[PDB]
Every structure is written in structure tokens, then in C-alpha cells.
Amino acid sequence: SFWEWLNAVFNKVDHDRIRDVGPDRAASEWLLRCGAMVRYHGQQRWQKDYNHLPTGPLDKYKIQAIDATDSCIMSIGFDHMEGLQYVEKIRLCKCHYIEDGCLERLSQLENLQKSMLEMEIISCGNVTDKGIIALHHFRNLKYLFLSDLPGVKEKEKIVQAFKTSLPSLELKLDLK
Ligand SMILES: [Mg+2]
């Protein structure tokens, strides 16, 4: 369908673009075109309008936090995360196209395993226990907030899993 093609091309990585402007800028463009927001290290304010992303020096701004609320990010789109070195915080909220495979993809990026401190996954209806468990590879995670994930059916097992694999994790669960 047209709409499927459109979502795919919103997500698809342009590796020329990564070469030209660097991973953080290329990922910022992906996220904002897909309805997400980013915040750079050293800045208080968020980037929320694509057209206002900075044009100041090449590869200077580094993503610290991502807030993808009501966003069409999915699957291959997350390949834009591969070159990012400093991402500490990700919120995925009402990301209706995200699935376990998206979380798996993220969890396998060693760059994210090194940097990630906080993750929030809220009202992403496809996510299941499988996708959540994959997040144990984020070995430095300090905060994980899960909310309104009806596909997550065994929350007590999730708690016990993380209690072993990430004993210092603050795990906040608002799950039925
Ligand atoms: Mg949004």
C-alpha cells in the first residue's frame, strides 16, 4: 500500500546522509520527521520542529535524550541509532508501530548498551514480555518505566528477571 511505503521511506536510513552530516544529525532528522523529539547534550530545550534543527558546526550536537510520543518510528528506522555514542534516555510513548523486534534491534547496539541510563515504554500496544526482556543488555540502565503494555503478560517474571540481571535497576511498573 501507499501508506506502508510512506512509513517505510520515513524510516529508511540514507547512509549518504549519515556520511554528510554525521549520525546524530541524521538520526535527529529521522526522529523529527517521524514525529519524535530529541534533546542534545548541553541543551535544556528540545528539538521538536524539523525545520529548526541547528545548522551550526558539523557533527557538534549529540543526542542525549529521545522522546518519541505519537511517532511512526519502526524497525529499520532504528538503524539510525547505530552511530550514536551518547544516548542516555529514550521514551517510547504511543508508538503504535513498535514491536518486540524493534526493542531487540536496539538492545543489540553496543553503543546503546554502553550509554543508556533510562528507558520508558508507555502505551506501545504490540510490546510483549519478549521485547522487554531484551532490554537486559542495557547493562548500565538505572531506570525503566513500563506503562499500559497489554502484551506484557507476566510482569512478576519481568521483575524477578531484572532483579537478577540488573540489580540496581529502578523498575517502575504501571502494568495490568
Ligand atoms: Mg511526537
CSV table of N, CA and C and ligand atoms in Angstrom, one decimal:
chain,number,residue,atom,x,y,z
A,1,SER,N,0.8,-1.2,0.0
A,1,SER,CA,0.0,0.0,0.0
A,1,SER,C,0.9,1.2,0.0
A,2,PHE,N,0.2,2.3,-0.4
A,2,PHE,CA,0.9,3.6,-0.3
A,2,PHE,C,1.3,4.0,1.1
A,3,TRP,N,0.4,3.8,2.1
A,3,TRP,CA,0.7,4.2,3.5
A,3,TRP,C,1.9,3.4,4.0
A,4,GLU,N,2.0,2.1,3.7
A,4,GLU,CA,3.1,1.3,4.1
A,4,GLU,C,4.4,1.7,3.5
A,5,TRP,N,4.4,2.1,2.2
A,5,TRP,CA,5.6,2.6,1.6
A,5,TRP,C,6.0,3.9,2.3
A,6,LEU,N,5.0,4.7,2.5
A,6,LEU,CA,5.3,6.0,3.1
A,6,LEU,C,6.0,5.9,4.5
A,7,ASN,N,5.5,5.0,5.3
A,7,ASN,CA,6.1,4.8,6.6
A,7,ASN,C,7.5,4.2,6.5
A,8,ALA,N,7.6,3.3,5.5
A,8,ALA,CA,8.9,2.7,5.3
A,8,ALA,C,10.0,3.8,4.9
A,9,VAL,N,9.6,4.7,4.0
A,9,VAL,CA,10.5,5.6,3.5
A,9,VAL,C,10.8,6.7,4.5
A,10,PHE,N,9.9,7.0,5.4
A,10,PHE,CA,10.1,7.9,6.6
A,10,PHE,C,11.2,7.3,7.5
A,11,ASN,N,11.2,6.0,7.6
A,11,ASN,CA,12.2,5.2,8.5
A,11,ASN,C,13.5,4.9,7.8
A,12,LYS,N,13.5,4.7,6.5
A,12,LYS,CA,14.7,4.2,5.9
A,12,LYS,C,15.9,5.0,6.1
A,13,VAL,N,17.0,4.4,6.4
A,13,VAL,CA,18.3,5.1,6.5
A,13,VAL,C,18.9,5.5,5.2
A,14,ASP,N,19.2,6.8,5.1
A,14,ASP,CA,20.1,7.2,4.0
A,14,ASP,C,21.5,7.4,4.4
A,15,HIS,N,22.3,6.4,4.0
A,15,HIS,CA,23.7,6.3,4.5
A,15,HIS,C,24.6,7.4,3.9
A,16,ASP,N,24.2,8.0,2.8
A,16,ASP,CA,24.9,9.2,2.3
A,16,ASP,C,24.7,10.3,3.2
A,17,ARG,N,23.5,10.5,3.8
A,17,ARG,CA,23.2,11.5,4.7
A,17,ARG,C,24.0,11.4,6.0
A,18,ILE,N,24.1,10.1,6.5
A,18,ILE,CA,25.0,9.9,7.7
A,18,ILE,C,26.4,10.3,7.4
A,19,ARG,N,26.9,10.0,6.2
A,19,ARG,CA,28.3,10.4,5.9
A,19,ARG,C,28.4,11.8,5.8
A,20,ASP,N,27.4,12.6,5.3
A,20,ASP,CA,27.5,14.0,5.1
A,20,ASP,C,27.4,14.9,6.4
A,21,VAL,N,26.5,14.5,7.2
A,21,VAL,CA,26.2,15.3,8.4
A,21,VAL,C,26.4,14.6,9.7
A,22,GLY,N,26.8,13.4,9.7
A,22,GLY,CA,27.0,12.6,10.9
A,22,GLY,C,25.8,11.9,11.5
A,23,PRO,N,26.1,10.8,12.3
A,23,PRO,CA,25.0,10.1,12.8
A,23,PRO,C,24.0,10.9,13.6
A,24,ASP,N,24.4,11.8,14.5
A,24,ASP,CA,23.5,12.5,15.4
A,24,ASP,C,22.5,13.4,14.6
A,25,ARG,N,23.0,14.1,13.6
A,25,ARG,CA,22.1,14.9,12.8
A,25,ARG,C,21.2,14.1,11.9
A,26,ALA,N,21.7,13.0,11.3
A,26,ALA,CA,20.9,12.1,10.5
A,26,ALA,C,19.8,11.5,11.4
A,27,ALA,N,20.1,11.1,12.6
A,27,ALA,CA,19.1,10.5,13.5
A,27,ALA,C,18.1,11.5,14.0
A,28,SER,N,18.6,12.8,14.2
A,28,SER,CA,17.7,13.8,14.6
A,28,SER,C,16.6,14.1,13.5
A,29,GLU,N,17.1,14.0,12.2
A,29,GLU,CA,16.2,14.2,11.1
A,29,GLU,C,15.2,13.1,11.0
A,30,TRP,N,15.6,11.9,11.2
A,30,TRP,CA,14.7,10.7,11.2
A,30,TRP,C,13.7,10.8,12.3
A,31,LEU,N,14.2,11.1,13.5
A,31,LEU,CA,13.2,11.2,14.6
A,31,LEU,C,12.2,12.3,14.4
A,32,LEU,N,12.7,13.5,14.1
A,32,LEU,CA,11.7,14.6,13.9
A,32,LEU,C,10.8,14.4,12.8
A,33,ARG,N,11.2,13.8,11.6
A,33,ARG,CA,10.3,13.6,10.5
A,33,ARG,C,9.3,12.6,10.9
A,34,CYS,N,9.6,11.7,11.8
A,34,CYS,CA,8.7,10.7,12.3
A,34,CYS,C,7.9,11.0,13.5
A,35,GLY,N,7.9,12.3,13.9
A,35,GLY,CA,7.1,12.8,15.0
A,35,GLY,C,7.6,12.6,16.3
A,36,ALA,N,8.9,12.4,16.5
A,36,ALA,CA,9.6,12.3,17.7
A,36,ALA,C,10.4,13.6,18.0
A,37,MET,N,11.0,13.7,19.2
A,37,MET,CA,11.8,14.8,19.6
A,37,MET,C,13.1,14.3,20.1
A,38,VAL,N,14.1,15.2,20.1
A,38,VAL,CA,15.4,14.9,20.7
A,38,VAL,C,15.9,16.1,21.4
A,39,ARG,N,16.8,15.8,22.4
A,39,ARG,CA,17.4,16.9,23.1
A,39,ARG,C,18.9,16.6,23.2
A,40,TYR,N,19.7,17.6,22.8
A,40,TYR,CA,21.2,17.4,22.8
A,40,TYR,C,21.8,17.6,24.1
A,41,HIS,N,22.9,16.9,24.3
A,41,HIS,CA,23.8,17.2,25.5
A,41,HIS,C,24.1,18.7,25.5
A,42,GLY,N,24.0,19.2,26.7
A,42,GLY,CA,24.3,20.6,27.0
A,42,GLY,C,23.2,21.6,26.7
A,43,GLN,N,22.1,21.1,26.2
A,43,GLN,CA,20.9,22.0,26.0
A,43,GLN,C,19.7,21.6,26.8
A,44,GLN,N,19.1,22.6,27.3
A,44,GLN,CA,17.9,22.5,28.1
A,44,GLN,C,16.6,22.2,27.2
A,45,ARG,N,16.6,22.9,26.1
A,45,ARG,CA,15.4,22.9,25.2
A,45,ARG,C,15.5,21.7,24.3
A,46,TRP,N,14.3,21.2,23.9
A,46,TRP,CA,14.1,20.1,23.0
A,46,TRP,C,14.0,20.6,21.6
A,47,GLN,N,14.5,19.7,20.7
A,47,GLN,CA,14.2,19.9,19.2
A,47,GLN,C,12.9,19.2,18.9
A,48,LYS,N,12.0,20.0,18.4
A,48,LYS,CA,10.7,19.4,18.1
A,48,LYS,C,10.2,19.8,16.8
A,49,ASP,N,10.8,20.7,16.0
A,49,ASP,CA,10.4,21.1,14.6
A,49,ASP,C,11.6,20.9,13.7
A,50,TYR,N,11.3,19.9,12.8
A,50,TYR,CA,12.3,19.6,11.8
A,50,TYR,C,13.1,20.7,11.2
A,51,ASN,N,12.3,21.8,10.9
A,51,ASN,CA,12.9,22.9,10.2
A,51,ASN,C,13.8,23.8,11.0
A,52,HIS,N,13.8,23.6,12.3
A,52,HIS,CA,14.6,24.4,13.3
A,52,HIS,C,15.7,23.6,13.8
A,53,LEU,N,16.1,22.5,13.3
A,53,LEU,CA,17.3,21.8,13.7
A,53,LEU,C,18.4,22.7,13.4
A,54,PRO,N,19.5,22.7,14.3
A,54,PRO,CA,20.6,23.6,14.1
A,54,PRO,C,21.3,23.3,12.8
A,55,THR,N,21.9,24.4,12.3
A,55,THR,CA,22.8,24.3,11.1
A,55,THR,C,24.3,24.6,11.5
A,56,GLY,N,24.4,24.8,12.8
A,56,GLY,CA,25.7,25.1,13.4
A,56,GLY,C,26.5,23.9,13.8
A,57,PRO,N,27.9,24.0,13.6
A,57,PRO,CA,29.0,23.2,13.1
A,57,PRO,C,28.7,21.8,12.9
A,58,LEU,N,29.4,21.2,11.9
A,58,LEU,CA,29.3,19.8,11.6
A,58,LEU,C,29.6,18.8,12.7
A,59,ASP,N,28.5,18.1,13.0
A,59,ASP,CA,28.6,17.0,14.0
A,59,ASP,C,28.9,17.5,15.4
A,60,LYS,N,28.5,18.7,15.8
A,60,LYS,CA,28.7,19.2,17.1
A,60,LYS,C,27.7,18.7,18.1
A,61,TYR,N,26.5,18.7,17.8
A,61,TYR,CA,25.3,18.4,18.7
A,61,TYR,C,25.2,16.9,18.8
A,62,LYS,N,25.1,16.4,20.0
A,62,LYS,CA,25.0,15.0,20.3
A,62,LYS,C,23.7,14.7,21.0
A,63,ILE,N,22.9,13.7,20.5
A,63,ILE,CA,21.7,13.4,21.2
A,63,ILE,C,21.9,12.8,22.6
A,64,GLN,N,21.3,13.4,23.6
A,64,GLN,CA,21.3,12.8,24.9
A,64,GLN,C,20.0,12.1,25.2
A,65,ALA,N,18.8,12.7,24.8
A,65,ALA,CA,17.5,12.1,25.1
A,65,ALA,C,16.7,12.1,23.9
A,66,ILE,N,15.8,11.1,23.8
A,66,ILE,CA,14.8,11.0,22.8
A,66,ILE,C,13.5,10.8,23.4
A,67,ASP,N,12.5,11.5,22.9
A,67,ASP,CA,11.1,11.4,23.3
A,67,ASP,C,10.2,11.2,22.1
A,68,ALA,N,9.9,9.9,21.8
A,68,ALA,CA,9.1,9.5,20.6
A,68,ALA,C,7.7,9.2,21.2
A,69,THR,N,6.9,10.3,21.1
A,69,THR,CA,5.4,10.2,21.5
A,69,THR,C,4.6,10.3,20.3
A,70,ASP,N,3.7,9.4,20.0
A,70,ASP,CA,2.8,9.5,18.9
A,70,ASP,C,3.6,9.6,17.6
A,71,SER,N,4.6,8.7,17.5
A,71,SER,CA,5.6,8.7,16.4
A,71,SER,C,5.5,7.5,15.5
A,72,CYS,N,5.9,7.6,14.3
A,72,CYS,CA,5.8,6.4,13.4
A,72,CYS,C,7.1,5.7,13.2
A,73,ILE,N,8.0,5.8,14.1
A,73,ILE,CA,9.3,5.1,14.1
A,73,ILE,C,9.0,3.6,14.2
A,74,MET,N,9.9,2.8,13.5
A,74,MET,CA,9.7,1.4,13.5
A,74,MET,C,10.9,0.7,12.8
A,75,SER,N,11.2,-0.5,13.3
A,75,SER,CA,12.1,-1.4,12.7
A,75,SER,C,13.4,-0.8,12.2
A,76,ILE,N,13.5,-0.8,10.8
A,76,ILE,CA,14.7,-0.3,10.2
A,76,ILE,C,15.1,1.0,10.5
A,77,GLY,N,14.1,1.9,10.9
A,77,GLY,CA,14.4,3.2,11.3
A,77,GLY,C,15.5,3.3,12.4
A,78,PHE,N,15.4,2.3,13.3
A,78,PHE,CA,16.3,2.2,14.4
A,78,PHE,C,17.8,2.0,14.0
A,79,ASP,N,18.0,1.6,12.8
A,79,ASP,CA,19.4,1.6,12.3
A,79,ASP,C,20.1,3.0,12.3
A,80,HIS,N,19.3,4.0,12.4
A,80,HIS,CA,19.9,5.4,12.5
A,80,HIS,C,20.6,5.5,13.9
A,81,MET,N,20.3,4.6,14.8
A,81,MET,CA,20.8,4.7,16.2
A,81,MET,C,22.2,4.1,16.2
A,82,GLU,N,22.7,3.4,15.2
A,82,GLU,CA,23.9,2.7,15.2
A,82,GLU,C,25.1,3.5,15.5
A,83,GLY,N,25.2,4.7,15.0
A,83,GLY,CA,26.4,5.6,15.2
A,83,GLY,C,26.4,6.5,16.4
A,84,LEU,N,25.3,6.5,17.2
A,84,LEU,CA,25.1,7.4,18.3
A,84,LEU,C,25.9,6.9,19.5
A,85,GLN,N,26.7,7.8,20.1
A,85,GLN,CA,27.6,7.4,21.2
A,85,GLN,C,27.1,7.8,22.6
A,86,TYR,N,26.2,8.8,22.7
A,86,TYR,CA,25.9,9.4,23.9
A,86,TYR,C,24.4,9.4,24.4
A,87,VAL,N,23.6,8.5,23.8
A,87,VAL,CA,22.2,8.5,24.1
A,87,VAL,C,22.0,7.9,25.5
A,88,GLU,N,21.4,8.6,26.4
A,88,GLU,CA,21.2,8.2,27.8
A,88,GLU,C,19.7,7.9,28.2
A,89,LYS,N,18.8,8.6,27.5
A,89,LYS,CA,17.4,8.5,27.8
A,89,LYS,C,16.6,8.3,26.6
A,90,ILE,N,15.7,7.3,26.6
A,90,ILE,CA,14.7,7.1,25.5
A,90,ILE,C,13.4,6.8,26.1
A,91,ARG,N,12.4,7.6,25.6
A,91,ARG,CA,10.9,7.4,25.9
A,91,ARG,C,10.3,7.0,24.6
A,92,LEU,N,9.5,5.9,24.6
A,92,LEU,CA,8.7,5.4,23.6
A,92,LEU,C,7.3,5.4,24.1
A,93,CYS,N,6.4,6.3,23.6
A,93,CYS,CA,5.1,6.5,24.1
A,93,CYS,C,4.1,6.6,23.0
A,94,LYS,N,3.1,5.7,22.9
A,94,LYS,CA,2.1,5.7,21.9
A,94,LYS,C,2.8,5.7,20.5
A,95,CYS,N,3.8,4.7,20.4
A,95,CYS,CA,4.5,4.4,19.2
A,95,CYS,C,3.9,3.1,18.7
A,96,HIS,N,2.8,3.3,17.9
A,96,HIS,CA,1.9,2.2,17.5
A,96,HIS,C,2.5,1.2,16.6
A,97,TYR,N,3.6,1.5,16.0
A,97,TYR,CA,4.2,0.6,15.0
A,97,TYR,C,5.4,-0.2,15.6
A,98,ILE,N,5.9,0.2,16.8
A,98,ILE,CA,7.0,-0.5,17.5
A,98,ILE,C,6.5,-1.9,17.9
A,99,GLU,N,7.4,-2.9,17.8
A,99,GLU,CA,7.2,-4.2,18.2
A,99,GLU,C,8.4,-4.8,18.9
A,100,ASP,N,8.4,-6.0,19.4
A,100,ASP,CA,9.5,-6.6,20.1
A,100,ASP,C,10.8,-6.6,19.3
A,101,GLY,N,10.7,-6.8,18.0
A,101,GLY,CA,11.8,-6.8,17.1
A,101,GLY,C,12.5,-5.4,17.1
A,102,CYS,N,11.8,-4.3,17.3
A,102,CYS,CA,12.4,-3.0,17.5
A,102,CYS,C,13.3,-2.9,18.7
A,103,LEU,N,12.7,-3.4,19.8
A,103,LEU,CA,13.4,-3.4,21.1
A,103,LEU,C,14.6,-4.3,21.0
A,104,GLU,N,14.5,-5.5,20.4
A,104,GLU,CA,15.6,-6.4,20.2
A,104,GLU,C,16.7,-5.7,19.4
A,105,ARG,N,16.4,-5.1,18.3
A,105,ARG,CA,17.3,-4.3,17.5
A,105,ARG,C,18.1,-3.3,18.3
A,106,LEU,N,17.4,-2.5,19.1
A,106,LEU,CA,18.0,-1.5,20.0
A,106,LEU,C,18.9,-2.2,21.0
A,107,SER,N,18.5,-3.3,21.6
A,107,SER,CA,19.2,-3.9,22.7
A,107,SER,C,20.6,-4.4,22.2
A,108,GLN,N,20.7,-4.8,20.9
A,108,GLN,CA,21.9,-5.3,20.3
A,108,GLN,C,22.9,-4.3,19.9
A,109,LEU,N,22.6,-3.0,20.0
A,109,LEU,CA,23.5,-2.0,19.6
A,109,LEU,C,24.5,-1.7,20.8
A,110,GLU,N,25.8,-2.1,20.6
A,110,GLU,CA,26.7,-2.0,21.7
A,110,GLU,C,26.9,-0.6,22.2
A,111,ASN,N,26.8,0.4,21.2
A,111,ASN,CA,26.8,1.8,21.5
A,111,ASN,C,25.8,2.2,22.5
A,112,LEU,N,24.6,1.7,22.3
A,112,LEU,CA,23.5,2.0,23.3
A,112,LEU,C,23.6,1.3,24.6
A,113,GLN,N,24.1,0.0,24.5
A,113,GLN,CA,24.4,-0.7,25.8
A,113,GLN,C,25.3,0.1,26.7
A,114,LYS,N,26.3,0.7,26.1
A,114,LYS,CA,27.3,1.5,26.9
A,114,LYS,C,26.8,2.7,27.5
A,115,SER,N,25.9,3.4,26.8
A,115,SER,CA,25.4,4.7,27.2
A,115,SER,C,24.1,4.8,27.9
A,116,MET,N,23.2,3.8,27.7
A,116,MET,CA,21.8,4.0,28.1
A,116,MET,C,21.7,3.9,29.6
A,117,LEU,N,20.9,4.9,30.2
A,117,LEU,CA,20.6,5.0,31.6
A,117,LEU,C,19.2,4.9,31.9
A,118,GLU,N,18.3,5.4,31.1
A,118,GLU,CA,16.9,5.5,31.4
A,118,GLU,C,16.1,5.1,30.2
A,119,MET,N,15.0,4.3,30.4
A,119,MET,CA,14.1,4.0,29.3
A,119,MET,C,12.7,4.0,29.8
A,120,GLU,N,11.8,4.4,29.0
A,120,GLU,CA,10.4,4.5,29.3
A,120,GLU,C,9.6,3.9,28.1
A,121,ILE,N,8.7,3.0,28.3
A,121,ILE,CA,7.9,2.4,27.3
A,121,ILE,C,6.4,2.4,27.7
A,122,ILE,N,5.6,3.2,27.0
A,122,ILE,CA,4.3,3.6,27.5
A,122,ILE,C,3.3,3.4,26.4
A,123,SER,N,2.3,2.6,26.6
A,123,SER,CA,1.2,2.6,25.6
A,123,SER,C,1.6,2.3,24.2
A,124,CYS,N,2.5,1.3,24.1
A,124,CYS,CA,3.0,0.7,22.8
A,124,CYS,C,2.4,-0.7,22.7
A,125,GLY,N,1.2,-0.8,22.1
A,125,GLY,CA,0.4,-2.0,22.3
A,125,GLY,C,0.9,-3.3,21.8
A,126,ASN,N,1.9,-3.3,20.9
A,126,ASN,CA,2.4,-4.6,20.4
A,126,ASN,C,3.5,-5.2,21.4
A,127,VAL,N,4.1,-4.4,22.3
A,127,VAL,CA,5.2,-4.9,23.0
A,127,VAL,C,4.8,-6.0,23.9
A,128,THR,N,5.6,-7.0,24.0
A,128,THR,CA,5.4,-8.2,24.9
A,128,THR,C,6.6,-8.4,25.8
A,129,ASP,N,6.4,-9.4,26.6
A,129,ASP,CA,7.5,-9.8,27.6
A,129,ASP,C,8.8,-10.0,26.8
A,130,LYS,N,8.7,-10.5,25.6
A,130,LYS,CA,9.9,-10.8,24.9
A,130,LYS,C,10.7,-9.5,24.6
A,131,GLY,N,10.1,-8.5,24.2
A,131,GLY,CA,10.7,-7.3,23.9
A,131,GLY,C,11.3,-6.6,25.1
A,132,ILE,N,10.6,-6.7,26.2
A,132,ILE,CA,11.1,-6.1,27.5
A,132,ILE,C,12.3,-6.8,27.9
A,133,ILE,N,12.3,-8.1,27.9
A,133,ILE,CA,13.4,-8.9,28.4
A,133,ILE,C,14.7,-8.6,27.7
A,134,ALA,N,14.6,-8.3,26.4
A,134,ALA,CA,15.7,-8.0,25.6
A,134,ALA,C,16.5,-6.8,26.2
A,135,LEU,N,15.8,-5.9,26.9
A,135,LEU,CA,16.5,-4.7,27.4
A,135,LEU,C,17.5,-5.0,28.5
A,136,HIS,N,17.6,-6.2,29.0
A,136,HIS,CA,18.6,-6.6,29.9
A,136,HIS,C,20.0,-6.3,29.4
A,137,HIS,N,20.2,-6.3,28.1
A,137,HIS,CA,21.5,-5.9,27.5
A,137,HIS,C,22.0,-4.5,27.8
A,138,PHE,N,21.0,-3.6,28.2
A,138,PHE,CA,21.4,-2.3,28.6
A,138,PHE,C,21.9,-2.3,30.0
A,139,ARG,N,23.1,-2.8,30.1
A,139,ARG,CA,23.8,-3.2,31.4
A,139,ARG,C,24.0,-2.0,32.3
A,140,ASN,N,23.9,-0.8,31.9
A,140,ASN,CA,24.0,0.4,32.7
A,140,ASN,C,22.7,1.1,33.0
A,141,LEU,N,21.6,0.4,32.7
A,141,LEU,CA,20.3,1.0,32.9
A,141,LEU,C,20.0,1.2,34.4
A,142,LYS,N,19.6,2.4,34.8
A,142,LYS,CA,19.2,2.7,36.1
A,142,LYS,C,17.7,2.9,36.3
A,143,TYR,N,17.0,3.2,35.3
A,143,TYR,CA,15.5,3.5,35.4
A,143,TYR,C,14.8,2.9,34.2
A,144,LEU,N,13.8,2.1,34.5
A,144,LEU,CA,12.9,1.5,33.4
A,144,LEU,C,11.5,1.7,33.9
A,145,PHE,N,10.7,2.4,33.1
A,145,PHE,CA,9.3,2.7,33.4
A,145,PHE,C,8.5,2.0,32.3
A,146,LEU,N,7.6,1.1,32.6
A,146,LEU,CA,6.7,0.4,31.7
A,146,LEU,C,5.3,0.7,32.1
A,147,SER,N,4.5,1.1,31.2
A,147,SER,CA,3.1,1.5,31.4
A,147,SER,C,2.2,1.1,30.3
A,148,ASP,N,1.0,0.5,30.6
A,148,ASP,CA,0.0,0.3,29.6
A,148,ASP,C,0.5,-0.5,28.4
A,149,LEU,N,1.1,-1.6,28.7
A,149,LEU,CA,1.6,-2.6,27.7
A,149,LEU,C,0.8,-3.8,27.9
A,150,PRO,N,-0.4,-3.9,27.2
A,150,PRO,CA,-1.2,-5.1,27.5
A,150,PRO,C,-0.6,-6.4,27.0
A,151,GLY,N,0.3,-6.4,26.1
A,151,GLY,CA,1.0,-7.5,25.7
A,151,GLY,C,2.0,-8.1,26.6
A,152,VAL,N,2.3,-7.3,27.7
A,152,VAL,CA,3.2,-7.8,28.7
A,152,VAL,C,2.4,-8.5,29.8
A,153,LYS,N,2.5,-9.8,29.7
A,153,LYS,CA,1.5,-10.7,30.4
A,153,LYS,C,2.1,-11.3,31.7
A,154,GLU,N,3.4,-11.2,31.9
A,154,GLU,CA,4.0,-11.9,33.0
A,154,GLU,C,4.9,-10.9,33.8
A,155,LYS,N,4.3,-9.8,34.3
A,155,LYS,CA,5.1,-8.8,34.9
A,155,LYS,C,5.9,-9.3,36.1
A,156,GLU,N,5.5,-10.2,36.8
A,156,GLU,CA,6.2,-10.7,38.0
A,156,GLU,C,7.5,-11.4,37.6
A,157,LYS,N,7.4,-12.1,36.5
A,157,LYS,CA,8.6,-12.7,36.0
A,157,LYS,C,9.6,-11.6,35.5
A,158,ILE,N,9.1,-10.6,34.9
A,158,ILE,CA,10.0,-9.4,34.4
A,158,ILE,C,10.7,-8.9,35.7
A,159,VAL,N,10.0,-8.6,36.7
A,159,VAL,CA,10.6,-8.1,37.9
A,159,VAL,C,11.7,-9.0,38.4
A,160,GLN,N,11.4,-10.3,38.5
A,160,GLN,CA,12.5,-11.2,39.0
A,160,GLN,C,13.7,-11.3,38.1
A,161,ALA,N,13.4,-11.3,36.8
A,161,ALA,CA,14.5,-11.3,35.7
A,161,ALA,C,15.4,-10.2,35.9
A,162,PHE,N,14.8,-9.0,36.0
A,162,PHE,CA,15.7,-7.8,36.1
A,162,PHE,C,16.3,-7.7,37.5
A,163,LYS,N,15.8,-8.4,38.5
A,163,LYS,CA,16.3,-8.3,39.8
A,163,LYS,C,17.6,-9.1,39.8
A,164,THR,N,17.7,-10.0,39.0
A,164,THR,CA,19.0,-10.8,38.8
A,164,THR,C,19.9,-10.1,37.8
A,165,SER,N,19.4,-9.6,36.6
A,165,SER,CA,20.3,-9.2,35.5
A,165,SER,C,20.6,-7.8,35.6
A,166,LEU,N,19.9,-7.0,36.4
A,166,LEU,CA,20.1,-5.6,36.6
A,166,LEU,C,19.7,-5.2,38.1
A,167,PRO,N,20.4,-5.7,39.1
A,167,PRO,CA,20.0,-5.5,40.5
A,167,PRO,C,19.9,-4.1,40.9
A,168,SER,N,20.6,-3.2,40.2
A,168,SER,CA,20.5,-1.8,40.6
A,168,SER,C,19.3,-1.0,39.9
A,169,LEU,N,18.6,-1.7,39.1
A,169,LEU,CA,17.6,-1.0,38.3
A,169,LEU,C,16.4,-0.5,39.1
A,170,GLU,N,16.0,0.7,39.0
A,170,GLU,CA,14.7,1.2,39.5
A,170,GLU,C,13.7,0.9,38.4
A,171,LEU,N,12.9,-0.1,38.7
A,171,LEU,CA,11.8,-0.6,37.7
A,171,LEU,C,10.5,-0.2,38.2
A,172,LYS,N,9.9,0.7,37.4
A,172,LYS,CA,8.5,1.2,37.8
A,172,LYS,C,7.5,0.6,36.8
A,173,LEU,N,6.6,-0.1,37.3
A,173,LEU,CA,5.6,-0.8,36.5
A,173,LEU,C,4.2,-0.3,36.8
A,174,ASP,N,3.6,0.2,35.7
A,174,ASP,CA,2.2,0.5,35.7
A,174,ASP,C,1.5,-0.4,34.7
A,175,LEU,N,1.4,-1.6,35.0
A,175,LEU,CA,1.0,-2.7,34.1
A,175,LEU,C,-0.1,-3.5,34.7
A,176,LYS,N,-1.1,-3.8,33.9
A,176,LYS,CA,-2.3,-4.6,34.4
A,176,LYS,C,-1.9,-6.0,34.5
B,1,MG,MG,5.6,13.4,18.9
